[PDB]
């Protein structure tokens, strides 16, 4: 019995690399840039969007703000440690951010089932956790095939399990690679879900 | 850094369950049927198929020759025990065999990259092992995902190429999951390359 | 230029095919089960489901209430109807009704993205559309291979656009395979949306 | 009864665009390289490839041989006029081609399933058509999805079988989106199939 063609999640504590990133200062950052963004928060009720977001936005936000260039800079080493767990061959070209946005999840706030195309790895950088349930649903992208493959056992081990939920803490980072199928579960909690997501390109 | 959404790949010498299979015994059965199903032969020649199967002539094998029921109980524990490894809810009902079938490939012969519908478990005895070459390459089920993804180092771990090659010796029999895409690469010795396949599925 | 590996949307007036079953007489059967169910209702709190399903309450609808009879009948002829478009070959044995249960979602209801397993054709018929938007998301199948291929213009046919956003009236009945993805956006309308979903398997 | 997620055949003589291209100017020229490629000859020795190719050996073929260049000219029009049928939202880039290699491939020659990693339309003109056996079988990329559906008659309709055979003739040439899985069947006839396959990606 050998164990083959595995995904790889990625989760670990930002402070493990890079500079610090204060996580009280950063709350406040996500929020002085929602309250200023009067284009992100007219496109979000424009399209009955549950929260806000600065994906259709605002793009460069670390040259524009300098904690986020931080992040940035984190994230780097981050996600270069992990091309090494994964064993990228990838020339001289490291993996570069191509897209980074800012989420704030209210209650009843959720996220459809989606991947990221054009990218690498993928990953979310945690600001503020309430609640104590799942801030991350991840999908078997062998589901599709499995359809007459009988169900798993209730209790079986995480390797075998369908759906994988993530409860992470505040300053944590889960990077996976940008083909894994993930969906962002509703907040049950009253207070706000902030995160930061981004995509990591290569070429 | 977790590893996730696990293929598992059964290998292990058929000894180790059921009653005692004579490695001799088996080669010359095999032969023997081979020899005598002309109806087998004469689709292998109409089909222009490389070397021979019983696929399409045969059924019900263990019903007919005796050291084929003592293969298929041996196959029977071999499976339910692969099936406890991936922990399937299985209810009341076990997994039965519903396909099994003679291969005997010679000096060049292949078959193309496949999969098994309506079935949960598929599996390869090897009954002839000629030569230092393989009898399957599996393929990463992710593969077709992967189309932005760098390529894995040359010298990368096995649970993360997307392609897996097993040389087996003779009586061992590989079991997986029938969703799984595996190829039988060109014999390149002289001598047959004799191997018995079987499906499983669920009551 | 050929158009292959097509994927099927069966979209119909469930009038086509069976006896006459009266959409008033219907939307106020759902209702009166739903009352009375008082697993159902238990079980929808307790596991924080946005409305109300019987799928895991109420098993044999058809067998306790004269017009889901009427309503599986008609189901029958449409399924079967269907597997002649799909050019199936089932040899003697047609498709069966496996699973049937309702759905009543009201004002910020949805359904996550999912699929149905062991089953051949799923479906669902409409007994109450307020609203006028979209009462089925459908996603391509090969959305996770095309990670490199550039997205579609905003304006293209619908045989290529990766998501199909479904729009049936009062009666309507829509029928797919049941290996493709699709989902249930947002009730935007106040008022509740009730739907009968249900599962044919083959063997 | 609708048609959806359609995966697109491009199919049409060379000579629709493009400059003027001999045909047996073309299969001389193809014949004069790899006969002076001794590395390519010692690639295909080294690695016991069936035939020949020129993938591992040499690089910008239009760059050295005047023909090609006349060739690459016409295949640009030829992809640009798929993009346009696929309906490709492709911005200010255009589709440019990064790989281009020569297939020569003799009695009993095959090539294993397989795609085209990091590309957007991948294609194969065709320079040498002996015998009326298959050049092409392409395989459904919801092959897997389907383990619990029944086959397809045997005489069913074409967008709806899961393998596709094409016979091309001579100066013919494919294209397909490059996630799309296609096998090289086996040649039958004692003269060579020669081909020339190449990669477009996007800028
Ligand atoms: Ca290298
Ligand atoms: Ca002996
Ligand atoms: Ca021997
Ligand atoms: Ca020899
Ligand atoms: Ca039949
Ligand atoms: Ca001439
Ligand atoms: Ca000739
Ligand atoms: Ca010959
Ligand atoms: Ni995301
Ligand atoms: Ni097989
Ligand atoms: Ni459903
Ligand atoms: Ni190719």
């Not at 996580?23 to 969007?49: L, R």
């Not at 801030?135 to 589901?143: V, Y």
Request: charge should be negative; aromatic fraction near 10%.
């Amino acid at each position: 019995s050998l164990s083959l063609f595995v995904t790889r999640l990625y989760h670990a504590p930002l402070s493990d690399h890079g500079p610090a990133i204060d996580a009280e200062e950063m709350e406040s950052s996500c929020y002085a840039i929602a309250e200023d963004d009067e284009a992100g928060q007219g496109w979000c009720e424009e399209n009955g969007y549950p929260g806000y977001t600065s994906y259709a936005s605002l793009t460069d936000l670390p040259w524009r703000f300098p904690i986020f260039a931080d992040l940035v800079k984190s994230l780097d080493a981050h996600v270069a440690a992990f091309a090494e767990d994964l064993e990228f061959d990838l020339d001289g070209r490291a993996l570069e951010l191509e897209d980074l946005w800012i989420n704030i999840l209210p209650e009843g706030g959720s996220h459809a089932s989606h991947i990221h195309p054009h990218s690498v790895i993928s990953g979310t950088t945690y600001v503020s956790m309430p609640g104590g349930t799942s801030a991350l649903k991840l999908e078997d992208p062998r589901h599709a095939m499995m359809m007459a493959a009988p169900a798993r056992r209730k209790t079986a081990r995480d390797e075998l399990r369908q759906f994988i939920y993530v409860t992470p803490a505040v300053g944590d980072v889960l990077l996976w690679e940008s083909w894994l199928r993930h969906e962002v579960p509703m907040n049950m909690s009253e207070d706000d879900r902030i995160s930061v997501s981004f995509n990591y390109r290569w070429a």
